[PDB]
């Protein structure tokens, strides 16, 4: 997708401030909690019986770190998300068969996580920019369905 | 179906928001207008610029209908009947837009309630907004 | 909320389907499996080939739960409680899949009820399947 | 999107049998009826107070004919839906601001219409093929959002 210089600036300034070791786990964690059916794809992760168990689960944070990495990777190739997400698309679509709607959900959960961490710094225009980005990643992750 | 804990969680959140409810409602609407431009077509006659008294005025109405929903959580269908009539019948509001505003409402709470917006509360708030939205799109005939 | 005319319309449709209900349910499931491959992951242990006795057997259960829903249309929540428990809790069935099967169920009726599937009946049937689906995804906790 | 020779054959054989002067109106008509909010985009069309009024409305059938035309156009460029739908995408997304979900709905309504007209001839595999096509058109019509 195409972000304007202001949107790119609003996105990168805030991103640089992100704790890459925590925000991915927080978002994955919250997805598993807010949309329970998602846990179906993580039977090997252990205890997910409670939100506290989910959020403190080592596997979760570890896996969320990877997810964030892919998001960062995406922020670096805003103008080439299709190519960037190719193998993740085959993995998520052809192997896992994750319904795409869940890609949009995780993206929106990320946005919630960012709003929660950054407060008033996560302005409406800063959010609008971030919505274009998570929309882009979701679209790209789902290319193997198109 | 909202669980008793969800009710307790949503109650607490509203509690904390306090007198900011009106103001947070305007911010959610602005967040929606900027993030999901397609939603702007329902407000052709509104000035949607930042600081718009019409937007602030509307966020108050939105926040109030949500407070009424909360104050009457076990019968939102009844409490929200006139509103759902208005949204489906007269306004023809595409159901998908309810998910867009609900998300923006979540984002607004998250941006203002650091200690409150826990995973669990986020889950409860999410379910409450989906219930309100179900009711609001219920009169589609 | 289903209107009295929707109830009359859904009743008529069921009426016409008669003893084919079981068979049409299997066809809907097959239509779903072929059209929306992602739905197959919930039936890893099912043989999903054409003519599969497990699929036919399952379409009967699906058709029967829907008939029960129809026979108890003013309290589908109560009638469908055990089923929604099963679908959200144990099976973790992504809500979006309900829209996929509901559409396939519509397609199946349309393919078998030329005179019945009028725009109005199609609208009523659509609302009934969305109500059943709402109930079926209601226990997500 | 990519259809297999069998899917292409299943699609074109059935399509050739389509009454191009009626099926588009029937689908648009049913969309307006099954998903009422859609009528919002057609205030100039006149009487839409009842399903009978909707289905018999001249404007509707006339406009549905155009819509079908675009579908046919799409069937001819299965391998290039993006280019084919460019101006319709700008019209539908940038000018009308129609939410994309409604593109998927109309597509699914079309499928219902075809099942209704063709009966057992509209087999599950024939449908699976047609779902790939309406998915493709919806995706292409929505490119101006991506
Ligand atoms: C924005 C959307 C998403 C992104 C960017 C993303 C990213 C990732 C990444 C980077 C991996 C690492 C794969 C590797 O080890 O090389 C992965 C794996 C995985 N993801 Fe996602 N993911 C997303 C959404 C989802 C969703 C929503 C689900 C489930 C509902 C899901 C289920 C999984 C599973 C099951 C694996 C484990 C794969 C394996 O090890 O075999 N993902 N994802
Ligand atoms: C969280 C769900 C929502 C609630 C609680 C809500 C609440 C309200 C209320 C209280 C009114 C004014 C009542 C009156 O004056 O009679 C209103 C009006 C309206 N709403 Fe909503 N609404 C919601 C979501 C939406 C969404 C999804 C849209 C579309 C993007 C929308 C579009 C409108 C419009 C255009 C009006 C009329 C405004 C005017 O011309 O004065 N609403 N809403
Ligand atoms: C129209 C809505 C639906 C109805 C009325 C329905 C009905 C049923 C019923 C009656 C059962 C068996 C009850 C029992 O043995 O305890 C069942 C089981 C099940 N359903 Fe559904 N269902 C619906 C939609 C779905 C969808 C959306 C999926 C997922 C794509 C799904 C996946 C399953 C699975 C995997 C089982 C367990 C099958 C087994 O292992 O025996 N259902 N369904
Ligand atoms: C598969 C999806 C769709 C296709 C292929 C399609 C196709 C068409 C075509 C070919 C036109 C003719 C434009 C011209 O005169 O050059 C058009 C116009 C129009 N469509 Fe669609 N359409 C689709 C879905 C929708 C939906 C779902 C809505 C509304 C909910 C919508 C609203 C309109 C309106 C308002 C016009 C009139 C534009 C004008 O004359 O200014 N369309 N569409």
Provide structural commentary.
Chains A, D: One of its GO terms (molecular function) is hemoglobin binding. Chains A, D: Belongs to the globin family. The complex is a heterotetramer, with 2 copies of chain A (about 150 residues) and 2 copies of chain B (about 140 residues). Chain A is an all-alpha fold. Chain A has a single domain (about 1-145), classed as Orthogonal Bundle (Globin-like), CATH 1.10.490.10. Chain A has helices at about 5-15, 25-35, 50-55, 60-75, 80-95, 100-120, 125-140. Chain A is globular, with a radius of gyration of 15 Å. Chain B is built from 7 helices and no strands. Chain B has helices at about 5-15, 20-35, 55-70, 75-80, 80-90, 95-110, 120-135. In chain B, helix 1 (about 5-15) packs across helix 7 and helix 2 (about 20-35) crosses helix 6. The longest helix of chain B is centred in the middle third of the chain and has 19 residues, at about 55-70. Chains in contact: A-B, A-C, A-D, B-C, B-D, C-D. The interface between A and D is small, with 5 and 5 residues. Bound molecules: protoporphyrin IX containing FE (HEM) (4 copies).
